């Protein structure tokens, strides 16, 4: 008449079996029942950071009711879940909603403690209009309503520390996030449920993988819900792999290619090759159909097992005698033995394949979930990693120890050997500039991510003053800078596997270094809104110049190590000594030899020829001209940029003079040959 017009019996859904194994949580549900059987303040309300399944603990209460695992005083009861949007949606006329609520409350009064009223998402019932707070304040006052509440911590603190009477009708139950192992047990029960659903096998090392890695690499949500994500999306992935198959797809592309080619040929013998590949495809397809039939039989036998489990639970709730034992004892001899026969048959026959969710599926859903590259080494990435020195000396010549330390950092990343208290490997760079510090970091970014700026390059001259820490972390709440957050925490919390360069750091004012002390030690770090962000999958690199006189004076006649100690003492006199203690390693640069200079000139010529061929102009060059550029573009005092700009001069100015002269014919090899002291461009 009124009740089931708007309410949901979850205990019926437990009888319907559409609910789920609620595992552990017994202390919590006990304390719930304790608050249920009070005199005053009878109404419990659940509190925790979301993901911990307050809905689940309510439904597990309902399951323990239907099982009769509760004590006696709450047996035979009702737990009925009430939407408010069910209540509202027809309230055209005034008072209509209020009459609905009033009739519901009076019929709850008529049930006389039969019903545990459950209301999800409780702070809706705060606001519906007075609406329900006063309009359940009599039912609050009487305690005949035994409402059970559910919320985030916040809307408790928003809305319920606002009223007093509503506060003192409800009793905080601080539901905690579980640990690793209770979550593991919950995962095993719902592993059984997920293999019931998604046509799979799930391996217990994949469970411990899900627990461990989601405890490391997801800084957003909490347990168990992230592990639910991992397992469920791996289930989807295996489902799609079995629904695909790639080898069938390769052969179908091959046969339609050869079919088109033969129909163009209509000598052929491609007729024979097409027929052979069609035969091969048909064989593998028939194998695929047989495997599909095998897994389909597996799903049917598992589903009939589950139907038997539901029926014997009906017999456990009601109290059927000997029919349940006869059903079990007759049934799962044969279903256990031909389940194992189908299991060994699939272990034979699956080729084209996988049915066990392993760790590798979890890792691939990780490295495509956020995208920290944790999956084990597919070799093009791995053999690209192993050539990393040559990769960098595609773009960065010399500075070899720096290259080595950087590659060591990348390797200790991908081996999984990084301590997750910390970022991957931090660096301070040194030496007088233009020797390829910022360009080395950009070359890393071109490697790892395939862009220069897709990396976080924040030069520090934005940060010379105390106040502009809010340019990176941000504004505290309650201002105008509340809708664009930070910029550093943003450009991590999008893509937490990224390079962060803070080039030329020692301009800045050292409260920026206070921020960066929290950075380099722990990697969680308070953003602007009053929460935190992971850093533990980044690399933070900073630069300097500060032993410029020292290195331009003394890189000769010294080793690497005492040079390091000397300029380390210099920066000790500059920074605080913690911030050089926090570094993974300081790497010291050096003045340069003319072979590096010539290689640099080669690199810039290749860039130049790229631009000119995009323009459409074509060059061979004197390399005596390169020698004269080398002899003129040298200095010890700077390095590479004066070479660059001298080359810029002594080529590109008279060259572009001749180009915008309308003089040089496109397509002709522009021989850059020397003059006596200039370098000529001819057309021959």
């Amino acid at each position: 008449q009124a009740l089931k017009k708007y309410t949901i019996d979850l205990t019926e859904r437990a009888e319907q079996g559409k609910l789920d194994p609620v595992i552990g949580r017994d202390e919590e549900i006990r304390r719930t029942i304790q608050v249920l059987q009070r005199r005053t303040k009878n109404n419990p309300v659940l509190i925790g950071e979301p993901g911990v399944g307050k809905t689940a603990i309510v439904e597990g209460l309902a399951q323990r009711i239907i099982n009769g695992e509760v004590p006696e005083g709450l047996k035979g009861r009702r737990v009925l879940a009430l939407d408010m949007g069910a209540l509202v949606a027809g309230a055209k006329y005034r008072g209509e909603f209020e009459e609905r609520l009033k009739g519901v409350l009076n019929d709850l009064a008529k049930q006389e403690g039969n019903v545990i009223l459950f209301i999800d998402a409780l702070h809706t019932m705060v606001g519906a209009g007075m609406d329900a707070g006063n309009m359940l304040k009599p039912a609050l006052a009487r305690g005949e309503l035994h409402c059970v509440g559910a919320t985030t911590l916040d809307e408790y603190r928003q809305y319920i520390e606002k009223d007093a009477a509503l506060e003192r009708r409800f009793q905080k139950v601080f539901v905690a996030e579980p640990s690793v192992e209770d979550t593991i047990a919950i995962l095993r029960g719902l592993k059984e449920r997920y293999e019931l659903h998604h046509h799979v096998q799930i391996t217990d090392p994949a469970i411990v993988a899900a627990a461990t890695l989601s405890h490391r690499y997801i800084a957003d949500r909490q347990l168990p819900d992230k592990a639910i994500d991992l397992i469920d999306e791996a289930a989807s992935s295996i489902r799609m792999q079995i629904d695909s198959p790639e080898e069938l797809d390769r052969l179908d592309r091959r046969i339609i290619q050869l079919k088109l080619e033969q129909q163009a040929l209509m000598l052929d013998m491609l007729n024979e090759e097409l027929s052979d590949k069609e035969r091969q495809y048909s064989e593998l397809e028939e194998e695929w159909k047989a495997e599909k039939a095998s897994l389909s039989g597996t799903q049917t036998i598992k589903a009939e097992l589950e139907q038997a489990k539901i029926a014997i639970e009906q017999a456990r709730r009601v109290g059927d005698l000997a029919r349940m034992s006869e059903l079990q004892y007759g049934k799962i001899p044969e279903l256990e033995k031909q389940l194992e026969a189908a299991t060994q048959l699939e272990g034979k026959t699956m080729r084209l394949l996988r049915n066990k969710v392993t760790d590798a599926e979890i890792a691939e859903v990780l490295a495509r979930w956020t995208g920290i590259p944790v999956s084990r080494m597919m070799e093009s990435e791995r053999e690209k990693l192993l050539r990393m020195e040559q990769e960098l000396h595609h773009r960065v010549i010399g500075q070899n120890e720096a290259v080595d330390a950087v590659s060591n950092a990348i390797r200790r990343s991908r081996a999984g050997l990084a301590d997750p208290n910390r970022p991957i490997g931090s660096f301070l760079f040194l030496g007088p500039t233009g020797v390829g510090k910022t360009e080395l970091c950009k070359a890393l970014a071109n490697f790892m991510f395939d862009s220069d700026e897709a990396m976080v390059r924040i030069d520090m001259s934005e940060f010379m003053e105390k106040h502009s820490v809010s340019r990176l972390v941000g504004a505290p709440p309650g201002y105008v800078g509340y809708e664009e957050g930070g910029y550093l925490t943003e450009a991590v919390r999008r893509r937490p596997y990224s390079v962060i360069l803070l080039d030329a750091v020692e301009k800045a004012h050292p409260d920026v270094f206070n921020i960066l002390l929290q950075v380099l030690d722990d990697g969680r770090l308070t953003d602007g809104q009053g929460r935190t962000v992971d850093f533990r999958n980044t690399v933070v690199i900073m630069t300097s110049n500060l032993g410029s006189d020292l290195i331009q004076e003394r890189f000769g006649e010294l080793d690497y190590a005492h040079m390091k100690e000397l300029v380390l003492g210099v920066v000790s006199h500059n920074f605080r000594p913690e911030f050089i203690n926090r570094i993974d390693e300081v790497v010291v640069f050096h003045p340069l030899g003319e072979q590096h200079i010539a290689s640099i000139a080669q690199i810039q010529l290749k860039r130049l020829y790229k631009r000119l061929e995009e323009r459409g102009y074509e060059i061979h060059i004197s390399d005596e001209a390169l020698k004269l550029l080398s002899e003129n573009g040298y200095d010890p005092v700077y390095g590479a940029r004066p070479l660059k700009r001298a080359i810029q001069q002594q080529i590109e100015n008279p060259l572009a003079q001749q180009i915008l002269s309308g003089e040089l014919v496109p397509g002709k090899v522009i021989r850059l040959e020397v003059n006596e002291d200039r370098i000529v461009a001819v057309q021959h």
Binding site: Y93, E465, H467, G478
Partner: peptide
């Protein structure tokens, strides 16, 4: 028999500024 409607009742926040005031 007369029914109801639903209203806007809209406004904005109040903001603050904040001012550094340099030492030297």
């Amino acid at each position: 028999a007369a029914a109801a409607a639903a209203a806007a009742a809209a406004a904005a926040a109040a903001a603050a500024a904040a001012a550094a005031a340099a030492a030297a």
